[PDB]
Amino acid sequence: MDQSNRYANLNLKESELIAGGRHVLCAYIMKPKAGFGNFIQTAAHFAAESSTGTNVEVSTTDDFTRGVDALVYEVDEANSLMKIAYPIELFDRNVIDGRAMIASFLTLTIGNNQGMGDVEYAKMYDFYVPPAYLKLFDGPSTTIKDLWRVLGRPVINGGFIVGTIIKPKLGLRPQPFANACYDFWLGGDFIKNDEPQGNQVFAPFKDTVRAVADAMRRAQDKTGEAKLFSFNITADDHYEMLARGEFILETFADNADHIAFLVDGYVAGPAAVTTARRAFPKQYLHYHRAGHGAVTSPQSKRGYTAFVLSKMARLQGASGIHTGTMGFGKMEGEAADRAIAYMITEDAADGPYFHQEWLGMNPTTPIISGGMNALRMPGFFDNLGHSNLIMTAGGGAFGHVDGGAAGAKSLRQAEQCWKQGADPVEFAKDHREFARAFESFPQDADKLYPNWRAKLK
Amino acid sequence: MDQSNRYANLNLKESELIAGGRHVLCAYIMKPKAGFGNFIQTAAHFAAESSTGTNVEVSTTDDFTRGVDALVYEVDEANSLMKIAYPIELFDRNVIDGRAMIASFLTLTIGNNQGMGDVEYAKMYDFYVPPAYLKLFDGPSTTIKDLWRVLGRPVINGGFIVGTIIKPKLGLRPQPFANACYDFWLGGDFIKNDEPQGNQVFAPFKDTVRAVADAMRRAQDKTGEAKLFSFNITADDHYEMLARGEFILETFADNADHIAFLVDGYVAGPAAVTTARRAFPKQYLHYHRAGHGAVTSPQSKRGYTAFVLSKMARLQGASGIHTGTMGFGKMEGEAADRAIAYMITEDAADGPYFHQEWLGMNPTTPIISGGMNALRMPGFFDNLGHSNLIMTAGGGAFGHVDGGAAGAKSLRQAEQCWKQGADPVEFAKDHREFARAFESFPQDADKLYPNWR
Amino acid sequence: TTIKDLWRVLGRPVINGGFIVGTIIKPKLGLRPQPFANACYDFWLGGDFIKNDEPQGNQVFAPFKDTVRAVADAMRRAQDKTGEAKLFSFNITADDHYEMLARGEFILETFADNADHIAFLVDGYVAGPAAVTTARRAFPKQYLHYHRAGHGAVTSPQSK
Ligand SMILES: [Mg+2]
Ligand SMILES: [Mg+2]
């Protein structure tokens, strides 16, 4: 059956839908399967499956139902574009506090529509949230501002947070793990657990947390500077997440405000993110997106983009989220992903299809991770336009010839170099640790700074 | 960094890895990106990223780390096949109870490896869980057995549970919603909330729950048979899920054991599933997989298959999960998906790559939903081989010419027809409601039963 | 939570959103639930914000649950008539931490889609820092209205 009469209204104007403030708008790149309806027919069916409908007419359908139908308001078949308007009354709300839930947004806008037999593929590229729905989201409670304050930096434009991941990803016992933390902290600010690190049998959670707490205390006493750690508290069980978080804060004691909580938000889901967000609003919530590539990759024609994911994470209340290296590291990414960073940090920003006003909702920090080092940094910062962010370089720090501490300093210096607009090769002459990064990663040094060896050694 | 020397050992035998009981095994269909390492090099890097490694050598790496490395033990480049052995010590365990978590399995085996710059794509098709790891998973607490007991059916081979979804998907107010439930329940057993139904402003949760409870009481008094409802308790907030669940059970009272709890497990995640599983172990946990098609579709070359999803759901403790219509309904699916059902229901079963022993872990029910009706059912049951399952037909029930109750009866009769081995067209002469399904869905009747007129 | 969050609910700009027109329903105590709610509705036809008077709560003549429900109905009616959002600041003060939680939780569930229109008033000087923190930590997303009743015993310039 053809449902385009009911679920398509191409005469609706996007500007009026936005001005009305009663509709969530979603922009998809969609292709119908061969042998079914045309583009508008398939889009109308997509809208029906994503709101009030099904594949057949039902006797229960009355007047009221029609008013909450999702509507295809714009199509561009040549570019495979479909835009759908979802009345805000469709989205589920908490009984306990009347607030919105991202689970409902996902269920309607990217749920059953992903398994439709007449659709080859459909991927969400952007969404618009009006004030009436936006204000019902948690939003971030803790921001980079709170990390800057702990570090003794200015709370506005406090700058670059030098970070790392203790490698190996898994395998280090509690004390060796803690010793590596101490070493890095002599030169750097921030350490994160690698995504799967927790309570493995060879590195029990409580032993590791205690050793790291001792290492932080020692590093702070030596350097006279505050240090930060992001612990993985991810679990299937809500109560396990609470047990981990509570143990950490009590253990760190006077250093409890130096602690972020990492959550594997993509694989554990929105429920895990919210547990951390609502139980620990005063602790920086570090959304780790491990597994997101299954849908967000440009190779994928389904689900949603990294842009959409990041925008949702801000609404969920992530204090920071991994935005990728934007083509400058080892993982998949593009230079145009800078727009992701601005969507999560600014009060107003443009997506690929919709302009978004955040109405003073707190920003989410871009966390930069994956195959970065001191040499690759100036190019990254040039593309982005700022260094108010966290960057974690595991290999870039501990792979430095002179070790972790020196590795941390080369990262520090690389951003200092970028900030003062200096030539990296010339800058390196007067900055040892940064100059030693060229020798640590020669392949990168030859590609990025072709004639470095002649000038430097 | 060529990391094949450390993270690849093709001389390891799969049979010995299984016999040892110390490794989770994963089977992936993978393709390297052009311009990087070869197949084995890329697989080794994949294994490193999925366990102990990174893209560069690090000074901190000691010899203990080497013992917990994931290892590529088998490759078949021509068929894009890569098999990896993950030592069970890698997987995270609860501090509170020492039990396993699926979140850790997912993070290692299908996490950061999905964003690697040197991999075009990689999708998991099967996994093997040894006894030492398997026994640490929750597993299902409630099964179809418990639903059969409530219905007054035999607890062994209690048969087909006739179900539906109250359509429209959203839009019905509490009393009209409840009236439709009552109507269906005159002929059927089971009703589920549609995946997004909850506490919308036009149909508040508490008003709807109360109206449905009244409708169940009325339908049970009229028919003299027990009726079942599966309520959506999904939420981002753990405490919201608890509030919904607790309210429902207190409201239904003496009918509280007639209630299943539906969780949008794919979009809300494992954390939401576990909340329901651990807080309400005595209530049938209905895993709704909405959104799964983003990765599970054969069109997708990434993430994991529907088979893998279903197998994980059993470990998580789903009492039932949607397995799709196996090519017989409106959604994407294939006849070979019958193997999904057997993996979730049997104590021993074969996946596409690994044989799995469940060690007496409870079964997860196959829930059949999406564009089904009485006409499409006999073909579905023939392919599967049994009718010990729940089937929900929204359009197939309320789209019936005579209405919901008659729609329910046509579904009942369609399974009776299959069970007896009768010809659907001839069976329909003696069974009105089933015969009226041909008239209700003529397009389907013409394809499946050409000369029905 | 700040005034920014109240401005957002009112549909005002989040920067310099301006003046929030408020009142206290007088008499301070004595109004039964429905007369109390009727007075709220009346004021809300022209104003934004209503606060409980400091001692208003669960008096025997105006039970807490009956009053909260009547006010919720009055807010809904006033918003439907005016087409503008309305705000209420409820007194949740108690000696018992769990009483404060019971009151707060009841209010938010009752107001439902209007739960972000609710502030929580605490008699912070007389009940003390412990009461303030209960509200602050249990309900961080609800505007915390510190009522200072009794402060004059020390803060007055007459006091040395
Ligand atoms: Mg990592
Ligand atoms: Mg459905």
Tab-separated table of C-alpha atoms in Angstrom, chain A residues 6 33 45 48-62 64-65 68 89-98 100-104 106-108 110-121 137 166-173 176 180 194-202 205-206 232 234-244 264 266-272 274-275 278 288-297 299-304 316 330-332 371 376 394-395 398-400 403-404 440-441 443, chain B residues 1 6 33 45 48-62 64-65 68-69 89-97 100-104 106-108 110-121 137 166-173 176 180 194-202 205-206 232 234-244 264 266-272 274-275 278 288-295 297 299-304 316 330-332 371 376 394-396 398-400 403-404 440-441:
chain	number	residue	atom	x	y	z
A	6	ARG	CA	-0.865	10.553	4.986
A	33	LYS	CA	15.371	-1.442	-2.676
A	45	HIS	CA	6.557	4.137	4.608
A	48	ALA	CA	5.111	5.508	9.123
A	49	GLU	CA	7.401	2.760	10.526
A	50	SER	CA	9.244	5.464	12.522
A	51	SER	CA	6.073	6.871	14.152
A	52	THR	CA	2.424	5.698	14.097
A	53	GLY	CA	2.161	3.181	11.281
A	54	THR	CA	2.653	-0.303	9.976
A	55	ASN	CA	2.522	-2.042	6.519
A	56	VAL	CA	-1.340	-2.377	6.550
A	57	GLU	CA	-4.413	-0.311	7.540
A	58	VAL	CA	-5.585	-1.075	11.120
A	59	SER	CA	-9.144	-0.729	12.533
A	60	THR	CA	-7.904	0.978	15.744
A	61	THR	CA	-6.541	4.079	13.871
A	62	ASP	CA	-8.578	7.187	14.842
A	64	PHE	CA	-5.881	11.742	17.246
A	65	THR	CA	-3.282	9.354	15.752
A	68	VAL	CA	1.235	12.704	15.782
A	89	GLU	CA	4.732	14.413	21.514
A	90	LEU	CA	5.945	11.059	20.068
A	91	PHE	CA	9.023	10.965	22.294
A	92	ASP	CA	8.903	9.108	25.597
A	93	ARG	CA	9.292	11.006	28.876
A	94	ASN	CA	10.244	9.878	32.378
A	95	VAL	CA	7.412	9.272	34.824
A	96	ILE	CA	9.771	10.153	37.710
A	97	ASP	CA	10.930	13.620	36.515
A	98	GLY	CA	9.259	14.446	33.154
A	100	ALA	CA	13.471	13.263	27.915
A	101	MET	CA	15.336	10.034	27.138
A	102	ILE	CA	17.655	9.491	24.137
A	103	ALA	CA	16.531	5.803	24.003
A	104	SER	CA	13.120	6.961	22.726
A	106	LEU	CA	16.773	6.400	18.866
A	107	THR	CA	13.866	3.907	18.881
A	108	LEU	CA	11.665	6.177	16.732
A	110	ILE	CA	16.730	5.071	13.850
A	111	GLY	CA	14.988	1.919	15.171
A	112	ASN	CA	12.758	-0.495	13.193
A	113	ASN	CA	13.316	1.671	10.070
A	114	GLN	CA	16.823	0.078	9.880
A	115	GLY	CA	15.380	-3.412	9.130
A	116	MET	CA	12.704	-2.509	6.538
A	117	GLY	CA	12.541	-4.928	3.612
A	118	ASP	CA	11.817	-2.225	0.975
A	119	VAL	CA	14.770	0.001	1.976
A	120	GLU	CA	18.294	-0.831	0.769
A	121	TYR	CA	19.818	1.537	3.321
A	137	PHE	CA	17.565	16.653	28.168
A	166	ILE	CA	48.763	3.669	29.587
A	167	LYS	CA	49.771	1.062	27.055
A	168	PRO	CA	49.767	-1.938	26.811
A	169	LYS	CA	45.951	-1.715	26.445
A	170	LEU	CA	45.658	-4.642	28.857
A	171	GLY	CA	48.255	-6.795	30.628
A	172	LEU	CA	49.966	-4.507	33.118
A	173	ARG	CA	49.640	-5.535	36.760
A	176	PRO	CA	53.678	-1.539	36.927
A	180	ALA	CA	53.859	4.127	34.240
A	194	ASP	CA	42.170	2.125	28.000
A	195	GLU	CA	38.500	1.227	27.087
A	196	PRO	CA	38.530	-2.417	28.341
A	197	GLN	CA	40.639	-1.868	31.533
A	198	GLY	CA	38.697	-2.575	34.717
A	199	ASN	CA	38.674	-5.590	37.038
A	200	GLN	CA	40.624	-8.195	35.038
A	201	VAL	CA	41.903	-11.181	37.112
A	202	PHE	CA	45.590	-10.141	36.599
A	205	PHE	CA	40.096	-3.039	40.112
A	206	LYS	CA	40.617	-2.196	43.779
A	232	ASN	CA	36.582	3.078	33.335
A	234	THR	CA	31.520	0.653	32.628
A	235	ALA	CA	29.392	-2.363	33.523
A	236	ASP	CA	26.170	-4.100	32.461
A	237	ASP	CA	24.998	-3.833	36.076
A	238	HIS	CA	24.033	-0.338	37.247
A	239	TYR	CA	25.061	-1.283	40.814
A	240	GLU	CA	28.537	-2.385	39.648
A	241	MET	CA	29.021	1.071	38.044
A	242	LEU	CA	28.007	2.661	41.372
A	243	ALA	CA	30.320	0.369	43.398
A	244	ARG	CA	33.306	1.272	41.154
A	264	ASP	CA	31.997	2.860	26.990
A	266	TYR	CA	28.326	3.157	22.450
A	267	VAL	CA	28.622	-0.541	23.449
A	268	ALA	CA	27.156	-0.308	27.011
A	269	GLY	CA	24.507	2.114	25.741
A	270	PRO	CA	22.646	5.270	26.837
A	271	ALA	CA	21.543	3.555	30.058
A	272	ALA	CA	25.194	3.227	31.219
A	274	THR	CA	22.955	8.104	32.243
A	275	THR	CA	23.898	5.989	35.297
A	278	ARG	CA	22.908	11.031	37.165
A	288	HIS	CA	34.401	6.520	25.144
A	289	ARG	CA	32.803	5.557	21.775
A	290	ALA	CA	34.482	2.142	21.133
A	291	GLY	CA	32.395	0.181	18.610
A	292	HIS	CA	30.775	3.288	16.999
A	293	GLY	CA	32.625	2.610	13.703
A	294	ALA	CA	30.199	-0.237	12.965
A	295	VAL	CA	27.628	2.436	11.947
A	296	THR	CA	29.456	5.823	11.844
A	297	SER	CA	32.106	4.807	9.283
A	299	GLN	CA	31.871	2.802	4.531
A	300	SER	CA	28.527	2.227	6.345
A	301	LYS	CA	25.377	3.428	4.572
A	302	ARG	CA	23.233	2.670	7.669
A	303	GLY	CA	22.524	3.938	11.167
A	304	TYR	CA	23.971	7.359	11.876
A	316	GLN	CA	22.884	12.700	27.188
A	330	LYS	CA	45.485	6.072	12.858
A	331	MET	CA	41.664	5.723	12.986
A	332	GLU	CA	39.118	6.575	10.290
A	371	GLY	CA	47.762	7.382	16.767
A	376	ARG	CA	51.224	15.203	14.002
A	394	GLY	CA	49.510	6.413	24.214
A	395	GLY	CA	52.068	5.519	21.555
A	398	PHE	CA	55.432	5.930	25.883
A	399	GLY	CA	56.923	5.319	22.396
A	400	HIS	CA	59.149	8.423	22.816
A	403	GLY	CA	60.318	7.579	27.852
A	404	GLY	CA	56.837	8.609	29.077
A	440	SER	CA	61.295	8.605	18.082
A	441	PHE	CA	58.946	8.574	15.061
A	443	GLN	CA	58.685	7.769	9.380
B	1	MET	CA	54.900	-2.084	12.841
B	6	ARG	CA	53.349	-11.611	18.285
B	33	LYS	CA	41.967	-1.224	3.143
B	45	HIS	CA	46.907	-5.491	14.047
B	48	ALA	CA	46.350	-6.183	18.900
B	49	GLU	CA	43.782	-3.335	18.872
B	50	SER	CA	41.198	-5.803	20.288
B	51	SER	CA	43.406	-6.886	23.236
B	52	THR	CA	46.804	-5.623	24.506
B	53	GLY	CA	48.280	-3.500	21.726
B	54	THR	CA	48.554	-0.234	19.901
B	55	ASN	CA	50.067	0.965	16.549
B	56	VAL	CA	53.634	1.467	17.998
B	57	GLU	CA	56.031	-0.400	20.350
B	58	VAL	CA	55.802	0.889	23.959
B	59	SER	CA	58.543	0.726	26.661
B	60	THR	CA	56.079	-0.456	29.358
B	61	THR	CA	55.274	-3.795	27.574
B	62	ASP	CA	56.566	-6.676	29.725
B	64	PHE	CA	53.186	-10.969	31.359
B	65	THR	CA	51.330	-8.847	28.746
B	68	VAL	CA	47.027	-12.302	27.457
B	69	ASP	CA	47.407	-11.226	23.802
B	89	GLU	CA	41.445	-13.301	31.453
B	90	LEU	CA	41.018	-10.218	29.186
B	91	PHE	CA	37.296	-9.923	29.923
B	92	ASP	CA	36.132	-7.628	32.697
B	93	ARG	CA	34.375	-9.069	35.764
B	94	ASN	CA	32.110	-7.477	38.384
B	95	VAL	CA	33.759	-6.423	41.626
B	96	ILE	CA	30.395	-6.979	43.435
B	97	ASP	CA	29.717	-10.604	42.373
B	100	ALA	CA	30.865	-11.553	33.539
B	101	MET	CA	29.571	-8.537	31.612
B	102	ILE	CA	28.689	-8.488	27.895
B	103	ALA	CA	29.874	-4.816	27.708
B	104	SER	CA	33.477	-6.026	28.113
B	106	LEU	CA	31.719	-6.133	23.049
B	107	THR	CA	34.424	-3.556	23.909
B	108	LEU	CA	37.251	-6.032	23.171
B	110	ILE	CA	33.817	-5.491	18.376
B	111	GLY	CA	34.954	-2.133	19.824
B	112	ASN	CA	37.860	0.064	18.620
B	113	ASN	CA	38.554	-2.512	15.878
B	114	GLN	CA	35.485	-1.105	14.056
B	115	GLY	CA	37.193	2.313	13.500
B	116	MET	CA	40.681	1.177	12.395
B	117	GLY	CA	42.066	3.179	9.471
B	118	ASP	CA	43.740	0.161	7.778
B	119	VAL	CA	40.575	-1.990	7.775
B	120	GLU	CA	37.874	-1.452	5.122
B	121	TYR	CA	35.380	-3.515	7.130
B	137	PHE	CA	26.930	-14.996	32.569
B	166	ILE	CA	-1.659	-2.876	19.416
B	167	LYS	CA	-1.420	-0.677	16.329
B	168	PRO	CA	-1.254	2.269	15.686
B	169	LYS	CA	2.360	2.106	16.907
B	170	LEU	CA	1.733	5.352	18.787
B	171	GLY	CA	-1.317	7.630	19.048
B	172	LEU	CA	-3.954	5.656	20.941
B	173	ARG	CA	-5.115	7.204	24.204
B	176	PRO	CA	-9.009	3.165	23.269
B	180	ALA	CA	-8.244	-2.818	21.602
B	194	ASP	CA	5.010	-1.401	20.398
B	195	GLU	CA	8.745	-0.541	20.943
B	196	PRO	CA	8.325	3.263	21.534
B	197	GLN	CA	5.079	3.109	23.633
B	198	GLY	CA	5.563	4.311	27.193
B	199	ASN	CA	4.750	7.630	28.861
B	200	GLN	CA	3.882	9.880	25.921
B	201	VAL	CA	1.965	13.090	26.844
B	202	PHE	CA	-1.225	11.864	25.038
B	205	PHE	CA	2.138	5.490	31.440
B	206	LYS	CA	0.145	5.173	34.675
B	232	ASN	CA	7.894	-1.435	27.616
B	234	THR	CA	12.869	1.024	28.650
B	235	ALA	CA	14.539	4.201	29.874
B	236	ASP	CA	17.961	5.855	29.949
B	237	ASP	CA	17.585	6.154	33.730
B	238	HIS	CA	17.885	2.886	35.687
B	239	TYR	CA	15.545	4.316	38.362
B	240	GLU	CA	12.866	5.129	35.740
B	241	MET	CA	12.941	1.468	34.603
B	242	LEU	CA	12.488	0.393	38.257
B	243	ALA	CA	9.637	2.883	38.819
B	244	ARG	CA	7.785	1.571	35.721
B	264	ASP	CA	14.632	-1.977	23.690
B	266	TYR	CA	19.787	-2.779	21.105
B	267	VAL	CA	19.229	1.022	21.359
B	268	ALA	CA	19.159	1.337	25.198
B	269	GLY	CA	22.006	-1.175	25.470
B	270	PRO	CA	23.156	-4.083	27.688
B	271	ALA	CA	22.917	-1.878	30.812
B	272	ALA	CA	19.125	-1.514	30.306
B	274	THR	CA	20.615	-6.144	32.836
B	275	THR	CA	18.595	-3.638	34.904
B	278	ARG	CA	18.598	-8.355	37.711
B	288	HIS	CA	13.096	-5.952	21.578
B	289	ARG	CA	15.943	-5.414	19.046
B	290	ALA	CA	14.745	-2.185	17.272
B	291	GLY	CA	17.699	-0.517	15.550
B	292	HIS	CA	19.759	-3.752	15.210
B	293	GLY	CA	19.422	-3.606	11.377
B	294	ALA	CA	22.006	-0.787	11.276
B	295	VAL	CA	24.689	-3.505	11.801
B	297	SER	CA	21.646	-6.376	7.916
B	299	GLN	CA	23.854	-4.987	3.445
B	300	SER	CA	26.179	-4.087	6.368
B	301	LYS	CA	29.738	-5.424	6.234
B	302	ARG	CA	30.447	-4.188	9.799
B	303	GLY	CA	29.641	-4.924	13.411
B	304	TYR	CA	27.943	-8.265	13.945
B	316	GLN	CA	22.578	-11.410	28.975
B	330	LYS	CA	7.992	-7.596	5.938
B	331	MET	CA	11.448	-7.084	7.512
B	332	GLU	CA	14.836	-8.253	6.222
B	371	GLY	CA	4.307	-8.366	8.779
B	376	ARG	CA	2.065	-16.583	5.983
B	394	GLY	CA	-0.229	-6.375	14.678
B	395	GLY	CA	-1.400	-5.897	11.124
B	396	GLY	CA	-2.262	-9.612	10.905
B	398	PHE	CA	-6.256	-5.744	13.728
B	399	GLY	CA	-6.125	-5.623	9.898
B	400	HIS	CA	-8.445	-8.665	9.779
B	403	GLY	CA	-11.552	-7.165	13.740
B	404	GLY	CA	-8.954	-8.005	16.402
B	440	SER	CA	-8.458	-9.523	4.667
B	441	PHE	CA	-5.063	-9.900	2.913
